[PDB]
Design a protein around this motif. Structure first.
Motif, PDB file in Angstrom:
ATOM      1  N   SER A   1     -10.430   5.377 -11.570  1.00 36.24           N
ATOM      2  CA  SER A   1     -10.238   5.865 -10.212  1.00 36.24           C
ATOM      3  C   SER A   1      -9.417   7.141 -10.240  1.00 36.24           C
ATOM      4  O   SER A   1      -8.236   7.121 -10.595  1.00 36.24           O
ATOM      5  CB  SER A   1      -9.542   4.811  -9.363  1.00 36.24           C
TER       6      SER A   1
ATOM      7  N   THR B   1      -8.443  -6.370  -8.164  1.00 34.82           N
ATOM      8  CA  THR B   1      -9.185  -5.119  -8.198  1.00 34.82           C
ATOM      9  C   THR B   1     -10.105  -5.066  -9.410  1.00 34.82           C
ATOM     10  O   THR B   1     -11.204  -4.511  -9.335  1.00 34.82           O
ATOM     11  CB  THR B   1      -8.211  -3.944  -8.231  1.00 34.82           C
TER      12      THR B   1
ATOM     13  N   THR C   1      -5.244   8.030  -8.113  1.00 32.64           N
ATOM     14  CA  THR C   1      -4.577   6.765  -7.805  1.00 32.64           C
ATOM     15  C   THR C   1      -3.377   6.602  -8.725  1.00 32.64           C
ATOM     16  O   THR C   1      -3.454   5.887  -9.729  1.00 32.64           O
ATOM     17  CB  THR C   1      -5.514   5.574  -7.979  1.00 32.64           C
TER      18      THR C   1
ATOM     19  N   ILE D   1      -2.265   7.816  -1.463  1.00 30.37           N
ATOM     20  CA  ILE D   1      -3.433   7.640  -2.316  1.00 30.37           C
ATOM     21  C   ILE D   1      -4.705   8.077  -1.588  1.00 30.37           C
ATOM     22  O   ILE D   1      -5.658   8.554  -2.227  1.00 30.37           O
ATOM     23  CB  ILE D   1      -3.466   6.176  -2.794  1.00 30.37           C
TER      24      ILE D   1
ATOM     25  N   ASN E   1     -12.154  -0.664  -5.170  1.00 27.00           N
ATOM     26  CA  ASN E   1     -11.239   0.179  -4.404  1.00 27.00           C
ATOM     27  C   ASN E   1     -10.164  -0.613  -3.670  1.00 27.00           C
ATOM     28  O   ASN E   1     -10.294  -0.837  -2.464  1.00 27.00           O
ATOM     29  CB  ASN E   1     -12.003   1.068  -3.418  1.00 27.00           C
ATOM     30  N   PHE E   2      -9.173  -1.117  -4.418  1.00 27.47           N
ATOM     31  CA  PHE E   2      -7.975  -1.776  -3.898  1.00 27.47           C
ATOM     32  C   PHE E   2      -8.314  -3.071  -3.179  1.00 27.47           C
ATOM     33  O   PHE E   2      -8.072  -3.200  -1.979  1.00 27.47           O
ATOM     34  CB  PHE E   2      -7.188  -0.878  -2.926  1.00 27.47           C
TER      35      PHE E   2
ATOM     36  N   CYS F   1       0.817  -1.199   0.000  1.00 26.18           N
ATOM     37  CA  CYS F   1       0.000   0.000   0.000  1.00 26.18           C
ATOM     38  C   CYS F   1       0.859   1.261   0.000  1.00 26.18           C
ATOM     39  O   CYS F   1       2.031   1.253   0.383  1.00 26.18           O
ATOM     40  CB  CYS F   1      -0.926   0.013   1.211  1.00 26.18           C
TER      41      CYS F   1
ATOM     42  N   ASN G   1     -13.010   1.031 -10.859  1.00 24.70           N
ATOM     43  CA  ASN G   1     -11.647   0.915 -10.369  1.00 24.70           C
ATOM     44  C   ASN G   1     -10.622   1.384 -11.391  1.00 24.70           C
ATOM     45  O   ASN G   1      -9.559   1.867 -10.999  1.00 24.70           O
ATOM     46  CB  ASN G   1     -11.349  -0.519  -9.961  1.00 24.70           C
TER      47      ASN G   1
ATOM     48  N   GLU H   1      -1.478   2.576  -9.341  1.00 16.59           N
ATOM     49  CA  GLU H   1      -2.155   1.537  -8.576  1.00 16.59           C
ATOM     50  C   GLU H   1      -1.955   0.171  -9.216  1.00 16.59           C
ATOM     51  O   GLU H   1      -1.601  -0.797  -8.535  1.00 16.59           O
ATOM     52  CB  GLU H   1      -3.640   1.859  -8.449  1.00 16.59           C
TER      53      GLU H   1
ATOM     54  N   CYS I   1      -6.852   1.076   1.652  1.00 13.17           N
ATOM     55  CA  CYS I   1      -6.314  -0.126   1.043  1.00 13.17           C
ATOM     56  C   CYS I   1      -5.726  -1.029   2.117  1.00 13.17           C
ATOM     57  O   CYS I   1      -5.122  -0.539   3.078  1.00 13.17           O
ATOM     58  CB  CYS I   1      -5.246   0.204  -0.012  1.00 13.17           C
TER      59      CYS I   1
ATOM     60  N   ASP J   1      -3.523  -6.245  -7.439  1.00 14.55           N
ATOM     61  CA  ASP J   1      -3.915  -5.295  -8.466  1.00 14.55           C
ATOM     62  C   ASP J   1      -4.672  -5.929  -9.619  1.00 14.55           C
ATOM     63  O   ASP J   1      -5.299  -5.201 -10.393  1.00 14.55           O
ATOM     64  CB  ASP J   1      -2.686  -4.563  -8.992  1.00 14.55           C
TER      65      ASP J   1
END
Ligand SMILES: CCCCCCCC(=O)OC[C@H](COP(=O)(O)O[C@@H]1[C@H](O)[C@H](O)[C@@H](OP(=O)(O)O)[C@H](OP(=O)(O)O)[C@H]1O)OC(=O)CCCCCCC
Ligand SMILES: CCCCCCCC(=O)OC[C@H](COP(=O)(O)O[C@@H]1[C@H](O)[C@H](O)[C@@H](OP(=O)(O)O)[C@H](OP(=O)(O)O)[C@H]1O)OC(=O)CCCCCCC
Ligand SMILES: Nc1ncnc2c1ncn2[C@@H]1O[C@H](COP(=O)(O)OP(=O)(O)OP(=O)(O)O)[C@@H](O)[C@H]1O
Ligand SMILES: Nc1ncnc2c1ncn2[C@@H]1O[C@H](COP(=O)(O)OP(=O)(O)OP(=O)(O)O)[C@@H](O)[C@H]1O
Ligand SMILES: [Mg+2]
Ligand SMILES: [Mg+2]
Lengths: 704, 704
Positions: free
Chosen positions: B391, B376, B394, B348, B360-361, B344, B388, B397, B352, B373
């Motif tokens: 987003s 997600t 981010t 951000i 969302n993570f 994490c 996602n 991500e 997470c 990832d």
């Protein structure tokens, strides 16, 4: 007033269908058709940001000079400065119009609406009309008049498009050969549609609002390949406008740059859908329909009155414009001395009062700690007055009597300012007059609602604009991209529909009313219910007979039919009579000017007319009939009218209804429509003058 | 496959023009025309919110049952539950389609695009097709397949519109007389356009995006009085959808109500206009054009392959659907075990990792403090996967390899899932496949840009959707009202234009490709450049001769021309031969069923056919020719075909080009188009089969 030639000629000599050219020429045409749609957007963005820069600088340094004498408690000196600056700017903006291009007056839409319907409105997209439209728009909206650069930007976009199409001004054209493909009348209609949507997007900073404005109201022959260039042009417009807002941030251009990107941003309200707010939203719609109907009915009478003053000379126009500007400035300075000062409230969280050229709770005669609720609206540029009425999170800022006074002032100024001899508009007075009663109903409801009164002002503006212009999709998308409130889009068009279908039960629109006053022959879309019980043969049984030419016609008959008749297309026969089609007047004057005369009645080959004419020379309309003088010895020669004939015209038979002939006429284009018999192979030509219901009802009055 | 009768009959007996009725009847018609446009919107909103409620509940209680075994470190039990629930839902959603309405497969647009072009596509807007489209859409998008309720909602809106138009199902119609005015084929086209825009607005929660979708792509005869009812119907749709989101807040309806009003809200980014972000935006456009071209070229081959499997029985369809669902579920569970876990980042600011049915993570096999990832994006409902990838705020991500794996998975699933025998769609797979490479280019640029990578995913989705569907205005307005980012609207259509005019240089669209695969006879807008050098007389010089009837025709010739020929309209002559017009087959079978037989060759008056027929009975198409058996003694009687003749047909002459005849044919409507001679007063009938370029090029192959 004539019409335009939309109908394609299918002969090889003309090369009208652009796909049938060479590969290099179709490459050059498909590149220039997008380069011009780029340059229309680029120049409309640059010229609208020049208008905004000059208008904000002039109105800002006028309002600062007013406020400097307001702050020293000298009200009469500020009134003299205000009235003098308004009178000087209105004097310039109406002297240029009445003495250099008298067609620049008025908005420009009610004509571009008729140019795109085929009516050749003359002297409309020149170069001096564009320049005096620009300078008149600057000097007219920077003088505090109840007009707006909303309208004139449509006409400036159309003039930019036509000056790019013909390659410069009307007598200073560049002699670039690659602009020979845009000499037609279909490419001009496409370019002017791109320029009109370019202008609406430059006015409201709304791309697809301008695309839908050119789709729904202005143009009438929409094409899906046109929907992709109008798209590109409004894209480049809003990119250039937002980039020249962002470059002029931090005061590098004086003023103009303390305003933001979206104009009337009210995207912070989060409108809800309570069930006790169905009655006031339909009241906003019903009252917008009634007030739009009444406003159209009174502006019709006011323009009927102004048609008398406009014919009494070129000085009565200037006196009318200066009198309107004087009455406007005297009211906008003297009316806020009637509303009493109300004290500030700390629950509003905005800074009150404020001194300057901007809005947001202005004071000018109140003591310290109070604010004038009329001078929030008057004594300001009209781009900020509507930001003050669209003010989110301001409960009970303006009283009832002050909003009544502002409403009763702007419903008078909207009547008497539209129609004067300066470049005026009609979006901004309806926006102001609608926001007035919208926030009046917002203050009248009070605690029995949950929508903010600024959103009631937005609903009032949209409802009066629908009740006075009868538009639905363009107004909802334009109010979306003005207000940035996406969650308002359902209720703001639930109010447009009630406004429009209440206003339709009383009057016409306002563009149809201005088209009816100017006498322009606009062809309606759907036919009347009595047009089906009348045939085309009965229409031609009440008309003068058709005049025709034969194929290898003698020069004497060509000269006789050009002098004695005013018709622009004649059918070609052969005298066994075989119809060939139509020939235009513009090619008769060309074969008379070219000296393409034959001795005998020989029908020529193809290579002779390939040697005489060229495909570019056949589309040059730079000719008249008076300069050419035919020798009376060579008036017995012969002209081969075969290779210039539009040999595939659109024909109907003499038992088709007038309704179906009108539907064909309007759906295809068609300046001219032949009438062949059922089983003399031509018995008439129908044109735009014959298929309008007002002309048919005068010949057969027993129909309605 | 036949066509539809758009052309108005102008006789008094038919009462086709609704303005020519009584005042009470025009009041009832103008009230019902808006009541049905209200009810289409109300029922499309209610049925789309029922689909959303059932889909969110089923997918939520499936993903919770998966996550309960994920959290107990039992991966194989979660895989068995996932594959079993997907297989059961796909089994129901394809058994209903292949055994109860096999026309419910596929999106629905490429047919409504052909119904609104006049092609009478059969069994398309029934009642069982609507019900199995609803239940198949629920069971197909709640099984995690790469489809979407985006498409099927257009077909459900059209079926709701047609079932409201004919007053119920096809054999359970209510006998309300006030629905007799909507029995025409113009009111059906208007209602189905309202229903199609109603469906697009119910799918994307975007009103004028749906209006512009029905304007630009689906319909082809747009009317300004239709633009005001489509408006009303999308208004009531988005009001009902947002009200049933707001009623189901706080978990009163289980799930469905933790999502908000606007779907993929990314309105918090404030995109800027840096000059080093011209190269990657045109790279997004160029790669979207190339990938849309390649995706169309491969989906064409995949649908060509699937046409072989669909003809091998009703069980190969079910095996193909179950195999696609099995491969989908095995990939969507087994692929995230390849991407390594990344830790994490506190910059951000979002929470997470996250465990649940929302995005969302997400983590599912990573230790505490890390997040997967890939999971997600996979292992989630596709309404949250695109939230996602869109987003905001981010940075980095998703990695490059995980985005490559997601892209290479969804470009395979978009090929192999579209075309299976469940109600599929095509917006959502292109949105996912475009967001993948959009955020891939966003991660590839990194610090050398200023636009957020979520906005690069929005640009990638819009650029692939333009490169694969060739739409401009509807996509920019739909991405506006999906993303709520008004300041993205310039650059998001600067990318659509590059995507479309790169994709046009390789392939066709995808609706034209699916129309070409299904063999539907779609009439293109503009004619070819070789159609101008071919005349209609040359077209009828390569055809069988026209069969005609006289006016007071004997019954034997009517029965002979009904048995031996398949034509649906015959010209009426009189044998001095005076053309009357066209008569349809549907009225020939009516005068044969009514026993309206005469003894002599008397031409009747008006009151006899007023006594026999009624204006409602002449529009009932509930007849066939096989049930009626004429006695051979009464096959020598006479039928007066005068008062049923379409006495004002659209005629061209035998020297018009095929290009101009096609332009008239498509611009007016016109199932049939007569050909009268220049100076046997009929020498042919042109129909839709004669004016398509593919049929003309097979007769005269020396043209192209
Ligand atoms: C950045 C935004 C866009 C950037 C790209 C700028 C170019 C751009 O945006 O569109 C590209 C342009 C499209 O031309 P555009 O769509 O305006 O023109 C229509 C198009 O050619 C249709 O195919 C025609 O129909 P059909 O075929 O007869 O059925 C239609 O005929 P009609 O309506 O007259 O009857 C034409 O009007 O041409 C290319 O695709 C080749 C690239 C060369 C053009 C390059 C010029 C710069
Ligand atoms: C949000 C609230 C708004 C909706 C409720 C209010 C209803 C509403 O929104 O429209 C009102 C309706 C307009 O009807 P609508 O515009 O759909 O119908 C067109 C209109 O009549 C045009 O004037 C016609 O052209 P023309 O004249 O021939 O040139 C056109 O003919 P064509 O195109 O067929 O050729 C018609 O199609 O007119 C009433 O006052 C009916 C009483 C309303 C009762 C209905 C109550 C539901
Ligand atoms: N030979 C002819 N050619 C054209 N119009 C004719 C002819 N004979 C009669 N007319 C009729 O005369 C009337 C006036 O025609 P006009 O001179 O305005 O034609 P026009 O200027 O070409 O029309 P427009 O340019 O507005 O299409 C029209 O209603 C038309 O129907
Ligand atoms: N008397 C006739 N009436 C109609 N079509 C005819 C006739 N004679 C020849 N044809 C031609 O026969 C071909 C097949 O016509 P078809 O039987 O498909 O007519 P249709 O079914 O009414 O056409 P559609 O319903 O698709 O408009 C058409 O190309 C048409 O041009
Ligand atoms: Mg004239
Ligand atoms: Mg058929």
């Amino acid at each position: 007033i004539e019409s335009l030639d939309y109908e394609i000629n299918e002969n090889d000599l003309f090369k009208h269908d652009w796909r049938s050219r060479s590969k290099a020429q179709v490459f050059q045409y498909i590149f220039l058709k997008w380069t011009l749609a780029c340059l229309v957007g680029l120049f409309t963005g640059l010229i609208a940001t020049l208008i905004n820069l000059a208008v904000e600088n002039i109105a800002g340094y006028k309002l600062l000079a007013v406020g400097y004498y307001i702050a020293q408690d000298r009200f009469w000196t500020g009134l003299m400065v205000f009235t003098g600056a308004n009178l000087g700017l209105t004097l310039v903006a109406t002297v240029l119009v009445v003495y250099f291009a008298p067609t620049a007056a008025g908005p420009g839409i009610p004509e571009i609406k008729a140019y795109l319907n085929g009516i050749d409105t003359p002297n409309m997209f020149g170069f001096t009309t564009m320049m005096v439209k620009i300078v008149g728009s600057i000097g007219a909206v920077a003088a505090g008049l109840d007009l707006g650069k909303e309208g004139p930007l449509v006409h400036i976009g159309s003039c930019i498009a036509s000056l790019l199409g013909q390659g410069g001004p009307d007598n200073h054209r560049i002699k670039w050969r690659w602009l020979r493909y845009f000499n037609n009348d279909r490419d001009r209609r496409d370019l002017i549609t791109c320029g009109s949507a370019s202008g609406v997007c430059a006015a409201f900073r709304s791309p697809v609002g301008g695309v839908l404005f050119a789709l729904e109201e202005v143009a009438t022959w929409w094409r899906s390949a046109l929907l992709w260039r109008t798209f590109f042009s409004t894209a480049v417009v809003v990119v250039v406008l937002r980039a020249f807002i962002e470059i002029c941030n931090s005061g590098k251009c004086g003023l103009f740059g303390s305003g933001g990107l979206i104009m009337f941003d009210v995207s912070h309200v989060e409108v809800r859908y309570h069930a006790a707010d169905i009655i006031p939203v339909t009241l906003i719609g019903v009252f917008g329909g009634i007030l739009g109907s009444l406003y159209n009915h009174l502006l019709h009478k006011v323009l009927r009155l102004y048609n008398l003053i406009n014919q009494k000379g070129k000085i009565h126009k200037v006196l009318l414009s200066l009198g309107v500007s004087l009455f406007t400035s005297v009211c906008l300075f003297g009316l806020p001395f009637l509303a009493e000062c109300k004290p500030c409230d700390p629950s509003i969280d905005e800074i009150c009062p404020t001194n300057g050229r901007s809005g947001n709770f202005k004071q000018f005669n109140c003591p310290n700690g109070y604010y004038n609720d009329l001078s929030t609206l008057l004594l300001t540029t009209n781009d900020d007055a509507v930001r003050n009425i669209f003010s989110s999170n301001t409960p009970n800022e303006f009283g009832m009597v002050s909003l009544w006074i502002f409403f009763g002032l702007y419903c008078i100024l909207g009547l008497i300012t539209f129609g004067i001899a300066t470049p005026s508009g009609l979006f901004l007075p309806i926006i102001l007059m609608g926001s007035a009663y919208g926030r009046m109903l917002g203050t009248a409801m009070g605690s029995y609602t949950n929508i903010d009164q600024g959103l009631y002002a937005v609903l009032g503006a949209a409802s009066l604009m629908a009740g006075s212009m009868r538009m639905t999709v363009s107004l909802c998308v334009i109010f979306l991209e003005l207000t940035n409130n996406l969650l308002l889009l359902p209720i703001t068009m639930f109010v447009l529909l009630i406004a429009k279908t209440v206003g339709d039960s009383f009057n016409l629109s306002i563009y149809e009313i201005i088209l009816h006053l100017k006498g322009l022959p606009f062809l309606e879309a759907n036919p009347e219910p009595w047009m089906r019980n009348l045939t085309v043969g009965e229409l031609n049984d009440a008309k003068p007979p058709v005049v025709t030419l034969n194929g290898v016609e003698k020069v004497a008959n060509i000269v006789d039919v050009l002098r004695n008749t005013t018709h622009n297309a004649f059918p070609v026969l052969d005298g066994g009579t075989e119809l060939h089609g139509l020939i235009l007047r513009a090619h008769l004057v060309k074969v008379l000017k070219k000296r393409w005369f034959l001795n005998e009645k020989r029908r020529t080959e193809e290579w002779e007319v390939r040697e005489k004419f060229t495909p570019v020379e056949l589309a040059e309309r730079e000719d008249n009939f008076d300069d050419v003088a035919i020798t009376s010895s060579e008036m017995q020669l012969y002209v081969d009218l075969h290779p210039l004939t539009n040999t595939t015209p659109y024909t109907v038979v003499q038992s088709m209804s007038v309704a179906k002939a009108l539907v064909l006429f309007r759906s295809v284009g068609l300046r001219h429509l032949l009438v062949v018999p059922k089983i003399s192979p031509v018995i008439g030509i129908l044109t735009r003058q014959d298929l309008r219901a007002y002309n048919i009802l005068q010949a057969f009055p027993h129909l309605d």
